Amino acid sequence: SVRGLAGVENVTELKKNFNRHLHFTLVKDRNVATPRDYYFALAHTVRDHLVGRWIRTQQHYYEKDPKRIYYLSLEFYMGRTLQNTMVNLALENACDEATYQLGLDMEELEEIEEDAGLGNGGLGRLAACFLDSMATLGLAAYGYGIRYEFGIFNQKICGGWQMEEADDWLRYGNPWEKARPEFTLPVHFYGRVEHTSQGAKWVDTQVVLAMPYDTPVPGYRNNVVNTMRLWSAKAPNDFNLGYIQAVLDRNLAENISRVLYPNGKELRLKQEYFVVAATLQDIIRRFKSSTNFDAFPDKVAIQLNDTHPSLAIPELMRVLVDLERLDWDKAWEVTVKTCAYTNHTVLPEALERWPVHLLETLLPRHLQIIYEINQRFLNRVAAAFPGDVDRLRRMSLVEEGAVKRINMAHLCIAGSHAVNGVARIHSEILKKTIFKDFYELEPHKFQNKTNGITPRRWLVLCNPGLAEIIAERIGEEYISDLDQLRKLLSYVDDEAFIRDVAKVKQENKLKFAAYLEREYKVHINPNSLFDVQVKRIHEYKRQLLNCLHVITLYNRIKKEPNKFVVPRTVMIGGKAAPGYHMAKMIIKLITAIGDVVNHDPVVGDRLRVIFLENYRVSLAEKVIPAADLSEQISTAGTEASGTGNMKFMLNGALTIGTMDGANVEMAEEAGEENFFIFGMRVEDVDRLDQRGYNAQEYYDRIPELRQIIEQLSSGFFSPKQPDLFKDIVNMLMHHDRFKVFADYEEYVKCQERVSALYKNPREWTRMVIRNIATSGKFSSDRTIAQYAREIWGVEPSRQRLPA
Amino acid sequence: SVRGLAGVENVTELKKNFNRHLHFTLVKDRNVATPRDYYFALAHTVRDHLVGRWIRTQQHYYEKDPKRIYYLSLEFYMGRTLQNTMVNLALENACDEATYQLGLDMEELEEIEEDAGLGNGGLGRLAACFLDSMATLGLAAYGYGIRYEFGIFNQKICGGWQMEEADDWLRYGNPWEKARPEFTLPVHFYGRVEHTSQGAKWVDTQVVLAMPYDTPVPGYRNNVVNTMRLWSAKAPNDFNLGYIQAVLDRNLAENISRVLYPNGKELRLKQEYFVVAATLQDIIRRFKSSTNFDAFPDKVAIQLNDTHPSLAIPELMRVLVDLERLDWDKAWEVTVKTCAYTNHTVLPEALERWPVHLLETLLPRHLQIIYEINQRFLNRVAAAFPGDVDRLRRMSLVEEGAVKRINMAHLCIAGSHAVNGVARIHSEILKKTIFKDFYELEPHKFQNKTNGITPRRWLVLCNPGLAEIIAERIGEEYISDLDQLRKLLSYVDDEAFIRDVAKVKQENKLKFAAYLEREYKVHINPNSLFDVQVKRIHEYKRQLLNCLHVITLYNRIKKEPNKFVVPRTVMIGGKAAPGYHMAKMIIKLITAIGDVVNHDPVVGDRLRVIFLENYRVSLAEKVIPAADLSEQISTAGTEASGTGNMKFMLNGALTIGTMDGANVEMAEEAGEENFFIFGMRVEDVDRLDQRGYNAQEYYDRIPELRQIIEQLSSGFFSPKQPDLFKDIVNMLMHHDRFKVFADYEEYVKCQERVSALYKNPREWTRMVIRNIATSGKFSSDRTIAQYAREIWGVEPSRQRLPA
Numbered sequence A, B: 001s002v003r004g005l006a007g008v009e010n011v012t013e014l015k016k017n018f019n020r021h022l023h024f025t026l027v028k029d030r031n032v033a034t035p036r037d038y039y040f041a042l043a044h045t046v047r048d049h050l051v052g053r054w055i056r057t058q059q060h061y062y063e064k065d066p067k068r069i070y071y072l073s074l075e076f077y078m079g080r081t082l083q084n085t086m087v088n089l090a091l092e093n094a095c096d097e098a099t100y101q102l103g104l105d106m107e108e109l110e111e112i113e114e115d116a117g118l119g120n121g122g123l124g125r126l127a128a129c130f131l132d133s134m135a136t137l138g139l140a141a142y143g144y145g146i147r148y149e150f151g152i153f154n155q156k157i158c159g160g161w162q163m164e165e166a167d168d169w170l171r172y173g174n175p176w177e178k179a180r181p182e183f184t185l186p187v188h189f190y191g192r193v194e195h196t197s198q199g200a201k202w203v204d205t206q207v208v209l210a211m212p213y214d215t216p217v218p219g220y221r222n223n224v225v226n227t228m229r230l231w232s233a234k235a236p237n238d239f240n241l242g243y244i245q246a247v248l249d250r251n252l253a254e255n256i257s258r259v260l261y262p263n264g265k266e267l268r269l270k271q272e273y274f275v276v277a278a279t280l281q282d283i284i285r286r287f288k289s290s291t292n293f294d295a296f297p298d299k300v301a302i303q304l305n306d307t308h309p310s311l312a313i314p315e316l317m318r319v320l321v322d323l324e325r326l327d328w329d330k331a332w333e334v335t336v337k338t339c340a341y342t343n344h345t346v347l348p349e350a351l352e353r354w355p356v357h358l359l360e361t362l363l364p365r366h367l368q369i370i371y372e373i374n375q376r377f378l379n380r381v382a383a384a385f386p387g388d389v390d391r392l393r394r395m396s397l398v399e400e401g402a403v404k405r406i407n408m409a410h411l412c413i414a415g416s417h418a419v420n421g422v423a424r425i426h427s428e429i430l431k432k433t434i435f436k437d438f439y440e441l442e443p444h445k446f447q448n449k450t451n452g453i454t455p456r457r458w459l460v461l462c463n464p465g466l467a468e469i470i471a472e473r474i475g476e477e478y479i480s481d482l483d484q485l486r487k488l489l490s491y492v493d494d495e496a497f498i499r500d501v502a503k504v505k506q507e508n509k510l511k512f513a514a515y516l517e518r519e520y521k522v523h524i525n526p527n528s529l530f531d532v533q534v535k536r537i538h539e540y541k542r543q544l545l546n547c548l549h550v551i552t553l554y555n556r557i558k559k560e561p562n563k564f565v566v567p568r569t570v571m572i573g574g575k576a577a578p579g580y581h582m583a584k585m586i587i588k589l590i591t592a593i594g595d596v597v598n599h600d601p602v603v604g605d606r607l608r609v610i611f612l613e614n615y616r617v618s619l620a621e622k623v624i625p626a627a628d629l630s631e632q633i634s635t636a637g638t639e640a641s642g643t644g645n646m647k648f649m650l651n652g653a654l655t656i657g658t659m660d661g662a663n664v665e666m667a668e669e670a671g672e673e674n675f676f677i678f679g680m681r682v683e684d685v686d687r688l689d690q691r692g693y694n695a696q697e698y699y700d701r702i703p704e705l706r707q708i709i710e711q712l713s714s715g716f717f718s719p720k721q722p723d724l725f726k727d728i729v730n731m732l733m734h735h736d737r738f739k740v741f742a743d744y745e746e747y748v749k750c751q752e753r754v755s756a757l758y759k760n761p762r763e764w765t766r767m768v769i770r771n772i773a774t775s776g777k778f779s780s781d782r783t784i785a786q787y788a789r790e791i792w793g794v795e796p797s798r799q800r801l802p803a
């Protein structure tokens, strides 16, 4: 029903276009076609329905000439496109019927599509949700990035160890993209700066070509189709031009767009400048086709997703000053009013600081511009806070020391009219700590825009069962207006609704339990509580704290085997960065625990530990609707927002978490009685750091914790390699930056409360209903409406374009 | 008229499919579309008409299960595909009308298509003509090769010097190919040989993937559409699997299909094995889908185009012996009956001899097989010619010496049931000289198959004006039965026909003269005799002899300025191999002569020297119909056949040439009175070599020749670099392998006879008519019918498949 109408004319028309594409496009007959061929024929049929809208949307923007939004990101974690396109075009039921009549299962065909895995995690998925919301809200918005030939690696688990393999996502082709080789642009590297009578000139550069590929981004049932433009690196035709080697060395230039970096390398800097330089030429071209750059900020907004595209600031200055001949002060005025910066973390290991010698060689003109920006900026600090010499060194874009570095975050703050964090607590921490000096100089710049997720992909698409039972009571309006879910509060005592919510969850769990047996040959009890933590493997996300709880349960079972315990399936998934040794050790630990627990006859089906292999958007869409418990247990102050948390909330899971990131706002919206909050607050973490964190203290005073550490050390979980986990124990005991032991007791206690509530199915489900009903604020439609009004200066619209 | 019907239903249907493709396929509206977009929309519309026939042709072969022909070549010089497809499908007039009604010029759109330049010259063009003829003759034939990312380089002339640039022919895409990533095959390199109880095993190999791309090859109006399958190199997904570098090093494997070699490097050997290994797996798969390999030669013919795919012989043995477990003698019987080899030249510099140490490392199992082939072969020689020890060393596949080499030609003769040359004189030279020993052992193996050209591309397509005036008198049957052109003999005294032939030539010359002004800003007299030599720049093709004639004419004009001479436009074109210094010097000489001649006021428009830049198939289609005189002046015994010669003959040019290659058969067919033959015969060249060639003798006895040499030496043609041409003069005087001076006198004399005949337009044209009328034998339909009956053991057919 939420999947639209299956009209007689539409079903007939889809069937014939399907057959046309199979014959003419794929060059196949029905007798030689594989499931893959059928997928492609379907993909091309659905794609056809986009193009008319795509052309008229871009035609519409040319006529109306609205302010254009440029969202610059090095990551767009798109996942699969087929189902999303059907949903947004109201084609899902029609295609389902059309394929059924051809003797095909549409769900089977959907599984053939590769994830577009052009992101690592939350940052890349946020960009993807944002594109969806911008189209749904009728904004003239463009996503700009890089078309990586290889996305995030596929994770294979071999002997409990992560193995990486190339994600060759383009092998069979991408039906969604359109190459635009006609709009290829030159990008310059290296060379030197020459000063003449008429200003500076950047000369003797190497040229790399930037070739755009456009992907359509459909809005939800409004006939708006926006563009995601991704640049591909091409060598010029006179490149290096014995002969054979010159042709083979073209690879060097084209390596720029070859691979997405996981997580100061020259290739990464090249990628960062490549996307920025090509994108800005496009922006200016489009602006000139509307001399007078005073109107530039009225027609252009550039959003810098993290500091990765921060070179947009000195690149824009370069173009305005060196090429368009504007004076410095006017160019700077235009730059600041055009650009805005989103910070994504306070963790020092993630902050970009480029060695000066790199910029010197690669982008000599940009370094000069950065120096000049810094000088003028520091003069302003000096005048506002006279004599405060330490403030000057703290605020400088140039970090002095062993190697000189440029702080890209400081560059972004200076060159932007708005700086935002991604959840209220994160945004406050920014103003109180790392950007305190900048906030004191320019308080007006600093904002919050709490993250969100798209309810199209993260409810309608992945959980149609839940979307439907909601639509039955309150209609379909909530899909583009998620605040309407509040209406579900008046159904909290409705015995029919309670039964339906719980039924949808059980079906999801049954479906996922089947998926596990079929594609991974693993057997789980679908009646157990589905306890899931899925996200990148990092020490701050504290997968290890989860591991300690799992082992505690196992040790409690072995101690009192004939005592009753609420059965659990504990699922942990996520990728470790290839060079991150500790993260790789944690994965090994998780599998090692499973090896012991899953094969202990005394445990039975009361406890299972499963490591979810190759976590990615398409896997998320399967496991999230099946979850009962969402683990969001980062040390308070470390997780800027989180977005997985919101996905679980929308899909009927209860949350055990710390007061970190968006968890704080989630608990505020639902009421803290409907959340399982535990552990230190930010203030408690601060107190512990001042006093000094001593892990040994917890080890000495908690016998259950001591036993686990002794088990890890002695080789209980690694019988043939007794010291395998020495690194983990050492880290926990002596250099734990994230205070795992400090939250252990309260975590285990809170987990007991979870189990207690699960014993009462009716009251569990009523609490679930109170969560789903208050999850409205965490729609990316809300987030994007806030960016539009408070940063970009444009009004969202829900009005249809003509079909 | 020869361009088919323009029906009301067809024109209407083409127009709507054109618009569909522009909208849905290209994602453009009429207001943003460029000529390139229109070309692509047309290309896709025409392509649609192929697929139905393509699918049913391959379906037809599956049912009827005929003997399959595999033509293995490292070069396929296809040129443009659009017009050729229209011609063979009878769509040319219909598309012309359909585009006219859309407000488009179809000829303009045709110029946008890039040449598929996957060949160097005659060898690659021969393969292309052959594919056309095989489809036209209804043979179940497949062309197999490599999809080079970069074809033959684009030639730029800068300051009279050749510059090479990458031929990025795939930049805008190739509408004609269909990627078949589903039929990807593994190819092995390196590793080592292991001997077990159950035979040899090739282990520890590196794997490169071979991905096929299929291109349709339509027959002439018979609804047959055959396949050209070209392999692309892909790295496996666990390749080298810090992380980033492993992904970037995938380039190394994929370099195999990156670039076509011009003209013993490891990359070239890899290309040669790559095409062979992937192709043979395909051949065997298709054969198994018809255990019993006795029937293999009844169902499979493999034609080795030159020695480049010669590894097919030991690869086939490897598969049959190591994998299928056949005994050596039976496998060898199957191999010999399956394979046939075409030799393309007797020139030693072109013969492939691979260092043993290369094969040792790259293909260790193949080396073992080659040694075993040699041993068994030499035992057979020893038994046939007992005690003849020098014969044994001469015939060995293994050449001993400083470095040990494998002679790939000797390998091909031993492993093939048929060996052919490419013109009668060439085939005789093979038996008399380089393969004399092999001919004495197995006389039955040795054949001739004189080359041919396709009358579709080389008459109908490039010279519609001539095709039409011929069709007016004798009908359209000759297009697929070129012997019918003999009927034109009865029109040699027909005043109407004479006028028409001459009119078509003048129009072609006017059209080409306009092309030169527009695309190259050069001005020529269209009334002058168009004297043209187009082909690869090589010393044996004797472009230098042409240069000496040009200078002689210039010196004769300057001597008697007010004397009347027949005006000439001398056009020379062709590419020099990048590392071939002498060839590059000859190009410079040609331009240097033009610089002097074209700007001498005394000369006027009586003599022009033009160097035709970037010679290629599409340029050939323009200049050949415009030519009056075809220069085919290789030293007798060096040009195996030539095919350009035949193109010129078919298109109304008279030929000045030596008795070399197919020139001998061309003069035989037309009668020698209708050809301008001059110079030494093969026997005369032999006599001169025995005596010793002394260039000085000619210099001393011919004052006109002396003057030219003195002009070159003194710096007449290079005023600012007086010694620029020292290398050329030195070579001519002291180490001329091709005896340029020896043919000078007779050449200049013969050129005078040409000029005399040109003064009498009526008698020139009557001789032209006698040439065109006897050009029938040089159709590749004839050549291929001979291969089919005499080598492959199959019957050609002109019967239509159902439409």
Ligand SMILES: OC[C@H]1CN(CCCc2ccccc2)C[C@@H](O)[C@@H]1O
Pocket: A122, A123, A126, A263, A344, A345, A347, A349, A350, A422, A451, A538, A639, A640, A641, A642, A643, A661
């Ligand atoms: O804003 C999107 C997400 C962005 N991420 C950025 C994580 C950055 C990071 C990267 C490597 C190591 C530590 C941290 C944090 C989440 O809390 C947010 O929800």
Ligand SMILES: OC[C@H]1CN(CCCc2ccccc2)C[C@@H](O)[C@@H]1O
Pocket: B122, B123, B126, B263, B344, B345, B347, B349, B350, B422, B451, B538, B639, B640, B641, B642, B643, B661
């Ligand atoms: O058979 C096709 C052509 C094949 N070519 C092969 C030329 C090979 C060669 C390549 C480099 C240097 C010298 C010779 C010779 C022509 O006479 C033939 O017509």
